[PDB]
Amino acid sequence: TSKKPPNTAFRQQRLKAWQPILSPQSVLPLLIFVACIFTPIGIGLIVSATKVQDLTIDYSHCDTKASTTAFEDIPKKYIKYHFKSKVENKPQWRLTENENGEQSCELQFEIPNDIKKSIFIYYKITNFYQNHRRYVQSFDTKQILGEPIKKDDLDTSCSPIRSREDKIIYPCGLIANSMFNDTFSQVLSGIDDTEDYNLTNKHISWSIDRHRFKTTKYNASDIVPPPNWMKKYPDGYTDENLPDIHTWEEFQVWMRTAAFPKFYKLTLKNESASLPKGKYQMNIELNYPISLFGGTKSFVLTTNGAIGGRNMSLGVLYLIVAGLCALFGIIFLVKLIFQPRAMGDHTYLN
Amino acid sequence: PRVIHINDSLANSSFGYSDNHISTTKYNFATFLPKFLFQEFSKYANLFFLCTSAIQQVPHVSPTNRYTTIGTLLVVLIVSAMKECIEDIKRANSDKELNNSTAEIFSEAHDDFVEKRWIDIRVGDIIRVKSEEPIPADTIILSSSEPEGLCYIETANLDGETNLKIKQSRVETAKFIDVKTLKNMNGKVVSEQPNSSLYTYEGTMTLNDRQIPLSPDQMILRGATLRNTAWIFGLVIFTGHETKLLRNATATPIKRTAVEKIINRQIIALFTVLIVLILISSIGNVIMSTADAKHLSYLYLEGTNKAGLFFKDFLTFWILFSNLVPISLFVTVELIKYYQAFMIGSDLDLYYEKTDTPTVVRTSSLVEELGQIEYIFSDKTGTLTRNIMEFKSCSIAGHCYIDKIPEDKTATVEDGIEVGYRKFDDLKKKLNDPSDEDSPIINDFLTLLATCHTVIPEFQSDGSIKYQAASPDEGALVQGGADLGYKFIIRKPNSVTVLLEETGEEKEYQLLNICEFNSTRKRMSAIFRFPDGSIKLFCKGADTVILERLDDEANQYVEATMRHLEDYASEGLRTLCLAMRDISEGEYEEWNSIYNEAATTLDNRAEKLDEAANLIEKNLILIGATAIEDKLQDGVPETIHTLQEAGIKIWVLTGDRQETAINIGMSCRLLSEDMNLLIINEETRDDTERNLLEKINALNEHQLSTHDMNTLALVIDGKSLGFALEPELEDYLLTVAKLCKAVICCRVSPLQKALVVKMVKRKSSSLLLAIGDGANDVSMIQAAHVGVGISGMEGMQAARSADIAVGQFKFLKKLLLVHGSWSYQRISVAILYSFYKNTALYMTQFWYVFANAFSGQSIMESWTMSFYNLFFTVWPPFVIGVFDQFVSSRLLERYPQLYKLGQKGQFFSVYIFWGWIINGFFHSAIVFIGTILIYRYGFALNMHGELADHWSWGVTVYTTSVIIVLGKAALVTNQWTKFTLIAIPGSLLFWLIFFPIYASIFPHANISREYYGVVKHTYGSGVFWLTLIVLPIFALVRDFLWKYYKRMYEPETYHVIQEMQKYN
Ligand SMILES: CCCCC/C=C/C/C=C\C/C=C\C/C=C\CCCC(=O)O[C@H](COC(=O)CCCCCCCCCCCCCCCCC)COP(=O)(O)O[C@@H]1[C@H](O)[C@@H](O)[C@H](OP(=O)(O)O)[C@@H](O)[C@H]1O
Ligand SMILES: CCCCCCCCCCCCCCCCCC(=O)OC[C@@H](COP(=O)(O)OC[C@@H](N)C(=O)O)OC(=O)CCCCCCCCCCCCCCC
Ligand SMILES: *[C@@H]1O[C@H](CO)[C@@H](O[C@@H]2O[C@H](CO)[C@@H](O[C@@H]3O[C@H](CO)[C@@H](O)[C@H](O)[C@@H]3O)[C@H](O)[C@H]2NC(C)=O)[C@H](O)[C@H]1NC(C)=O
Ligand SMILES: *[C@@H]1O[C@H](CO)[C@@H](O[C@@H]2O[C@H](CO)[C@@H](O)[C@H](O)[C@H]2NC(C)=O)[C@H](O)[C@H]1NC(C)=O
Ligand SMILES: *[C@@H]1O[C@H](CO)[C@@H](O)[C@H](O)[C@H]1NC(C)=O
Ligand code: ALF
Ligand SMILES: [Mg+2]
């Protein structure tokens, strides 16, 4: 017995096993348990999503539709809101224009109840492909850290926006070249005995972006702004116009690309107190044109919930699963009771 | 007509004959790659991987690494190449070992026989073959050490049996004994062209001025082996690849299984689907880039050329979507098949502890066929029958004696004529005392046993004498007389010496004349002279010839012997009747002159001698009858019965004659007495055609009842099968063979054993298995879909040339019922699942091309997409295709009909494949839609207003897809051992512990710099956990409910068997 195979449970394929069987003695109780545990979760999630009160104003087309003189009411196809009470006066808007030609949109809305919760101010963009293949990778990760990268050592992913007139462009790529540059006034001006609501701009992007985004080490005589930053920095950078992208948190927020053509970007927030009921006003500088991409930029004022925002999809999916399980459990139970199988243990065709 | 000169080799070599060069190697160092790469890239997965790796090398199209696919391709190609090189080296070693044989050629220089090698033996070299050395080439014998050119040759290679074949030289050329006279003879031999028919030969040999004919009585083939002869002189006619042995052999073809032929068409379909997806995406991309030229100005689109962008997005989408045909599947299938072969060759119930030779699977890539076999072609001796014939019973003086008496009829009832069984001890007790009347008949019987034969004994160094008999029945009769006490010893010419162990005295008998055995006579007569000076005639033969020639007034035991031949024939044993007679001197002096009258007529010798002998067999006295059994292996009838219950047709191709094949078929319960045997023994083409027409016309006219169909068998002769395989008479033989229950083919050359298999596999679409032993059926093993060789025995040519090697026949049951079916149920699933878990992920990459303007952006990091098929989805396929048993072994052995579940292909086909693919598409779409609905505007986190992004969502998609495929794997398994418990939940825990570690270290090392804050924005949020809990259940509820319904209200056969196993 030299070449005799071993006599072990593994080698002989007789391991200790456990064969499960799908029996109505254990499948129907499983469906009952699923339908009993998924309906409370779905109800809780839908309640938590409904408990979120917010407001949204599509301030696009404020150039032509809004009135220059006095306030006119915004059309209904641009306003959305969800509060615990009714709104007596609908939001309105006005178009202010300075002497040099720069315009601004002044929105005037009303909060009917005290929102004893943290307030957040986002801007919403649509039909903007932040996830295009030619657009996600187009940025140099070394200049973000501040390293004075030479011209030849510059990444090729910025190929169209990579150096101009024999000068290096400091913010590489197309992600920084096309940046949303509409400025929200960092205060909600209260109108008629309404106190001002002071927002803030610090601590907005991820806690890791305030660690990788560091002040550049370049010198201004080497770098030149992108083609779409020339209006803010005419005739190139200087020793004072050079920005430090360590505290420029709007740049950090914009660089973190989104996954869908319709996305939010945090711009302002307040978490110290609530805003009581009353009429408020927000001024928005109109710099970024929507004819560049063909979408709709909007101002959004929200709060925070257990799942973030007002979204019913999670509770709806929980309820769909619970309902399907309960329905098929009832169907199988009645088919079992009114029509017994009676298959037989020794009933076979071999 | 091949003309050959006998002496001058340099004169006959001008025609350009062979040079005894044999070649069993396919590849050489000058054309190894141009053929290996051609046979490797003749598949479809190899071409697909080659195209993918060639396209992936350009820079601006690859989202993943460029060296992984081509690296694994080169690795597997190197493995296959080195395996092929090892096999070719194994073949070349045997070829060189056979080529380095020391021959003896008659050189004219030395004018004597020198010791050269088998190579350079040209046509015409008068060679000398010594005692037991094999024959170098096709040689016509000229002389031998025997007095009249006689010689014995074993033909275990060109046939299957070890019985000595008689050859003899012509009377005009059997006088050249010394070598110094060989230089005197001359002439020329006109022979036939090189053919493959073994038992036929024709030609002429012209010496000085007189010519002599030739016949297979003089032709010696290359596969023979001289025995019981000191030396023979042979003139070579055929050599090398022109001999009738190695001209019929064929090369080794490439064997493909049915699963491979289904996988090829599945790959074609998947390639068409891939082309459809690529075309759709590229058309969408170009249409969008042409239409929205104004709204896409923030991307700085070039727009210089349309083709310059189209023929690039084509490649990008190819590389993005080519994961539908992965290579991890094509390496895991090979690993699973190798591990399955290892598991098959590791079972105790397939281990033969007599020769200590367990079974070994020498080709794993065919184990999947072990579950879908429909025919079985088998050779008789060695596989079914052990080459051991045994004298079992004798019946003398109206009694009957065996050694091992069974207890069913040990009590001899003495119902008038004595019927029953008595011991050999009581035979020796009625032999010992002289007072009994039958003792002169008993010893005359035992001398007819120990003297009438033609066995050549030989001694060994141990002293145990081995008998070399030209027929195994005469050898079993000699051994039956030998273990009874009458040992047969040294045989000189014209006398026989017998050693008697009863008394201790050594007798001797003067052999006067023997008449040879004939199938027309079925007799054998031998007149002898005794130490008494008396002349006695001994005669053995069948009862149907000698029972006409008795004196019923003289003998008194005919009624006992005919009933003993009737209960002997009721067990299928071969029987012979023994007769004797004292003769006088005057009739012997006349019959000697009648025998020399038959010696005078050389014009007629087949007809004259035997009927000149029949002058003296006008009257005989019957002694009794004998019974020789041909014992089979253990478990042969049970395995035949089980394999016929499981729905497998069993044929028997053998090189023996017809009667012994029919007897073996009757003994192993493969045939029966009620089975109408359609025997076709015609000798010409038109006669075989007429016979086949008569058979088919008599069969199709009557109604084919189930009893008539079951009780019908076919028996073909080799000379008739040589015509029944022509393109014309092929369909007739095929349609008359499929109606029968068992087919037997007799006198079949090694080439026809493969021609029959080729015909059956061409004229049908069924899988074939051929089990055999020895070398003659090697060509058979090469032709069948699966080959099995009997190992543990001497001359294991089949065990080396076959795909599987077994100890004996009785294992072929468990190799096919359990290990055969299991395999087919395992690997099949292990393939389908491998086409599922892959698609169910990468199809997300398709549903995303509508959300990014048909760009081609992926939603996961390249390294994670690579680790998907390496660390988290590799163990379920192995634990499904190795350690999964859908039904127990004892229930597979008890219900053979379950084998048919794999015989018709009810586990792997195009329909179930498309079902799995569509289920993968459905799961992918569900995951994508649910994830994009939960993460609407990225506002899904409750951490101070911070939002998610691209990678924090791709991670959730990846985790959900992994959990879903693991749940599907858990639903597919039947039994949950330990490897299944740590292979499906184990991968989930592995990923859930590996992601936080990989995303909190490798970003610091500039390896996948996207996961810098994903751990906190995923593992630190509740929406991630809630999605992980609610989406896989939503995706698997349909499969759970359909499984419950299918197993409850519409079960299959194996479902019922599993329900039996679970409770009982
Ligand atoms: C809304 C949520 C819905 C949840 C509930 C829905 C229920 C109905 C779903 C679909 C309706 C359509 C058909 C339903 C009606 C019948 C289902 C036929 C089921 C069927 O035999 O074939 C199956 C394919 O299964 C799908 O292909 C299943 C997929 C069905 C096709 C769906 C169409 C996909 C098209 C792409 C969608 C893209 C969406 C568009 C998104 C675009 C976004 C841009 C095959 O896999 P299977 O594992 O079950 O095979 C079984 C099973 O393994 C087991 O019972 C048996 O072995 P054992 O007993 O020994 O274990 C085995 O012999 C076999 O019977
Ligand atoms: C935590 C405790 C447990 C930890 C265990 C961790 C698991 C260890 C890991 C054990 C796994 C054992 C092999 C099981 C299959 C492995 C995956 C595979 O083989 O797939 C090839 C390719 C993936 O290709 P793809 O994703 O399917 O598609 C194409 C896609 N890349 C594209 O861009 O197109 O992989 C690679 O290239 C890198 C690895 C090369 C391995 C080469 C084979 C080894 C042979 C080995 C042969 C060995 C000898 C065999 C004979 C004895
Ligand atoms: C805020 O962002 C928008 C969006 O990029 C900026 O608008 C773009 O500003 C650049 C810079 O001047 C303009 O480029 C110029 O275009 C004219 C042709 O109209 C060309 O002759 C100049 O040489 C220069 O290339 C660009 O047209 C303009 N619009 C678009 C759709 O790109 C805007 O300047 C930014 N404002 C601030 C204050 O940052
Ligand atoms: C959030 O908003 C509240 C309400 O405006 C801020 O509280 C007031 O902040 C201003 C500015 O310093 C003070 O003059 C007021 O006295 C504060 N209110 C009270 C009742 O004392 C709060 O500072 C804001 N938190 C931020 C911006 O982080
Ligand atoms: C509060 O709001 C007023 C008016 O908008 C502003 O002048 C003041 O600076 C704000 N407080 C702080 C601390 O910024
Ligand atoms: F052993 Al055989 F024909 F009987 F090859
Ligand atoms: Mg054999």
Short mmCIF file of C-alpha atoms in Angstrom, two decimals, chain B residues 355-541:
data_model
loop_
_atom_site.label_atom_id
_atom_site.label_comp_id
_atom_site.label_asym_id
_atom_site.label_seq_id
_atom_site.Cartn_x
_atom_site.Cartn_y
_atom_site.Cartn_z
CA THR B 355 -1.58 -4.42 -7.77
CA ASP B 356 -1.50 -1.23 -5.65
CA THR B 357 -2.41 0.94 -8.65
CA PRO B 358 -4.95 3.72 -8.07
CA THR B 359 -6.69 5.48 -10.93
CA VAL B 360 -5.12 8.58 -12.49
CA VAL B 361 -6.67 11.17 -14.81
CA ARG B 362 -3.97 11.95 -17.37
CA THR B 363 -6.13 14.61 -19.06
CA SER B 364 -8.31 16.80 -16.85
CA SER B 365 -9.77 18.84 -19.73
CA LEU B 366 -12.08 15.90 -20.48
CA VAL B 367 -13.52 15.06 -17.04
CA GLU B 368 -16.63 17.07 -17.95
CA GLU B 369 -17.51 14.35 -20.46
CA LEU B 370 -17.68 11.66 -17.75
CA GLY B 371 -21.28 12.77 -17.11
CA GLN B 372 -22.60 12.51 -20.67
CA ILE B 373 -21.48 9.18 -22.15
CA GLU B 374 -23.83 7.25 -24.44
CA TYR B 375 -21.74 4.47 -26.02
CA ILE B 376 -19.02 2.20 -24.64
CA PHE B 377 -16.58 0.33 -26.89
CA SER B 378 -14.65 -2.41 -25.09
CA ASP B 379 -12.11 -5.10 -25.92
CA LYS B 380 -12.73 -8.60 -24.61
CA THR B 381 -9.67 -10.19 -22.98
CA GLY B 382 -7.91 -8.19 -20.28
CA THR B 383 -10.80 -5.78 -19.69
CA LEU B 384 -13.80 -8.11 -19.37
CA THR B 385 -12.13 -11.54 -19.28
CA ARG B 386 -8.93 -12.40 -17.47
CA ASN B 387 -6.64 -14.28 -19.84
CA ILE B 388 -6.93 -17.38 -17.62
CA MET B 389 -8.84 -20.48 -18.72
CA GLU B 390 -9.40 -23.10 -16.03
CA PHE B 391 -10.35 -26.78 -16.17
CA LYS B 392 -13.41 -26.81 -13.89
CA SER B 393 -15.27 -30.13 -14.12
CA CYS B 394 -14.95 -33.65 -15.50
CA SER B 395 -17.58 -36.35 -15.91
CA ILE B 396 -16.40 -39.97 -16.13
CA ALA B 397 -18.08 -43.33 -15.46
CA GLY B 398 -21.43 -41.54 -15.32
CA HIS B 399 -20.37 -39.37 -12.36
CA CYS B 400 -19.33 -35.72 -12.11
CA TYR B 401 -16.60 -34.13 -10.01
CA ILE B 402 -15.55 -30.62 -8.98
CA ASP B 403 -13.34 -29.38 -6.17
CA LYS B 404 -15.41 -26.39 -4.98
CA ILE B 405 -18.83 -28.00 -4.57
CA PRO B 406 -21.63 -25.44 -4.04
CA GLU B 407 -24.22 -26.11 -1.35
CA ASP B 408 -27.26 -25.58 -3.58
CA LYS B 409 -26.98 -29.06 -5.12
CA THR B 410 -24.26 -30.81 -3.12
CA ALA B 411 -26.81 -33.51 -2.29
CA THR B 412 -26.73 -35.82 -5.30
CA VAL B 413 -30.35 -36.92 -5.42
CA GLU B 414 -29.61 -40.21 -7.26
CA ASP B 415 -32.72 -39.72 -9.43
CA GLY B 416 -31.95 -42.74 -11.57
CA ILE B 417 -29.01 -41.44 -13.57
CA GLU B 418 -26.61 -39.78 -11.15
CA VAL B 419 -26.68 -35.98 -11.25
CA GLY B 420 -24.81 -33.84 -8.73
CA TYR B 421 -21.33 -32.81 -7.64
CA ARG B 422 -18.66 -34.85 -5.88
CA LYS B 423 -15.16 -33.92 -4.75
CA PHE B 424 -11.91 -34.64 -6.56
CA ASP B 425 -10.86 -36.56 -3.45
CA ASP B 426 -13.48 -39.21 -4.21
CA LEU B 427 -12.13 -39.21 -7.77
CA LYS B 428 -8.70 -40.10 -6.44
CA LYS B 429 -10.27 -42.69 -4.12
CA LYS B 430 -12.00 -44.48 -7.01
CA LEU B 431 -8.72 -44.12 -8.92
CA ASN B 432 -6.50 -45.67 -6.22
CA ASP B 433 -7.99 -49.10 -5.47
CA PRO B 434 -7.77 -51.49 -8.46
CA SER B 435 -10.96 -53.43 -7.66
CA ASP B 436 -13.19 -50.89 -9.41
CA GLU B 437 -14.09 -51.46 -13.06
CA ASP B 438 -13.83 -47.77 -14.06
CA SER B 439 -10.21 -47.27 -12.97
CA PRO B 440 -8.80 -48.37 -16.37
CA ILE B 441 -11.25 -45.85 -17.79
CA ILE B 442 -10.30 -43.21 -15.24
CA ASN B 443 -6.56 -43.47 -15.92
CA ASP B 444 -7.16 -43.73 -19.68
CA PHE B 445 -9.11 -40.47 -19.27
CA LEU B 446 -6.30 -38.82 -17.33
CA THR B 447 -3.76 -39.93 -19.93
CA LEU B 448 -5.97 -38.52 -22.67
CA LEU B 449 -5.83 -35.30 -20.64
CA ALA B 450 -2.05 -35.39 -20.14
CA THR B 451 -0.88 -36.79 -23.49
CA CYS B 452 -3.23 -35.87 -26.35
CA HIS B 453 -2.32 -32.17 -26.19
CA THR B 454 0.36 -30.19 -28.09
CA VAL B 455 1.63 -28.06 -25.19
CA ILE B 456 5.32 -27.08 -25.03
CA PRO B 457 6.51 -27.07 -21.39
CA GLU B 458 9.39 -25.03 -20.01
CA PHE B 459 11.20 -24.99 -16.67
CA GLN B 460 12.16 -21.97 -14.56
CA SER B 461 14.81 -21.35 -11.92
CA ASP B 462 12.19 -21.66 -9.15
CA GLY B 463 11.16 -25.09 -10.46
CA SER B 464 7.55 -24.16 -11.18
CA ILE B 465 7.08 -25.37 -14.76
CA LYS B 466 5.21 -23.07 -17.14
CA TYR B 467 3.30 -24.53 -20.09
CA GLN B 468 3.27 -22.70 -23.45
CA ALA B 469 0.14 -23.89 -25.26
CA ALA B 470 -0.98 -22.88 -28.74
CA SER B 471 -4.56 -23.02 -27.43
CA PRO B 472 -5.64 -22.07 -23.89
CA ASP B 473 -8.08 -24.96 -23.54
CA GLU B 474 -5.36 -27.55 -24.11
CA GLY B 475 -3.24 -25.69 -21.57
CA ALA B 476 -6.06 -25.72 -19.04
CA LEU B 477 -6.51 -29.44 -19.66
CA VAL B 478 -2.80 -29.99 -19.03
CA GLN B 479 -2.94 -27.96 -15.83
CA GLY B 480 -6.04 -29.92 -14.80
CA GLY B 481 -4.16 -33.16 -15.28
CA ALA B 482 -1.08 -31.67 -13.60
CA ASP B 483 -2.68 -30.56 -10.34
CA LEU B 484 -4.53 -33.88 -10.24
CA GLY B 485 -1.23 -35.80 -10.25
CA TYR B 486 -0.26 -36.41 -13.89
CA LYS B 487 2.36 -33.72 -14.53
CA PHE B 488 3.41 -33.21 -18.15
CA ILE B 489 7.18 -32.92 -18.58
CA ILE B 490 9.95 -32.87 -21.18
CA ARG B 491 8.60 -33.29 -24.72
CA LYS B 492 11.10 -34.58 -27.27
CA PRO B 493 10.17 -35.23 -30.91
CA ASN B 494 7.86 -38.21 -31.37
CA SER B 495 7.56 -39.12 -27.69
CA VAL B 496 5.82 -37.71 -24.62
CA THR B 497 7.15 -38.11 -21.07
CA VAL B 498 4.75 -37.94 -18.12
CA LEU B 499 5.65 -37.60 -14.45
CA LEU B 500 3.12 -39.37 -12.21
CA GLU B 501 2.84 -37.90 -8.71
CA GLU B 502 0.45 -40.62 -7.49
CA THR B 503 2.97 -43.48 -7.74
CA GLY B 504 6.15 -41.45 -8.28
CA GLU B 505 7.17 -43.29 -11.44
CA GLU B 506 7.93 -41.43 -14.67
CA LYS B 507 6.16 -42.98 -17.67
CA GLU B 508 6.56 -42.34 -21.41
CA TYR B 509 4.38 -42.79 -24.50
CA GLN B 510 5.62 -43.24 -28.07
CA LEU B 511 3.70 -40.80 -30.26
CA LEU B 512 2.84 -42.44 -33.58
CA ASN B 513 0.63 -39.88 -35.30
CA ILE B 514 -1.50 -36.82 -34.58
CA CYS B 515 -4.07 -35.24 -36.88
CA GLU B 516 -4.29 -31.48 -36.51
CA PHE B 517 -7.24 -29.57 -35.07
CA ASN B 518 -9.71 -28.23 -37.64
CA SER B 519 -12.76 -26.02 -37.28
CA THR B 520 -14.51 -28.11 -39.94
CA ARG B 521 -13.58 -31.34 -38.13
CA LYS B 522 -13.85 -29.91 -34.60
CA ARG B 523 -11.90 -33.05 -33.66
CA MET B 524 -8.35 -33.98 -32.72
CA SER B 525 -7.14 -37.57 -33.09
CA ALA B 526 -3.86 -39.08 -31.96
CA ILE B 527 -2.70 -42.69 -32.31
CA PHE B 528 -0.12 -43.72 -29.70
CA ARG B 529 2.04 -46.68 -28.67
CA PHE B 530 2.25 -47.50 -24.99
CA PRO B 531 4.76 -49.13 -22.63
CA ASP B 532 2.36 -52.09 -22.97
CA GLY B 533 3.26 -52.34 -26.67
CA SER B 534 -0.43 -51.71 -27.41
CA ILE B 535 -1.68 -49.16 -29.95
CA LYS B 536 -4.41 -46.84 -28.68
CA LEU B 537 -6.26 -43.98 -30.37
CA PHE B 538 -7.26 -40.86 -28.41
CA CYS B 539 -9.77 -38.39 -29.82
CA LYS B 540 -11.21 -35.19 -28.39
CA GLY B 541 -13.88 -33.03 -29.97
#
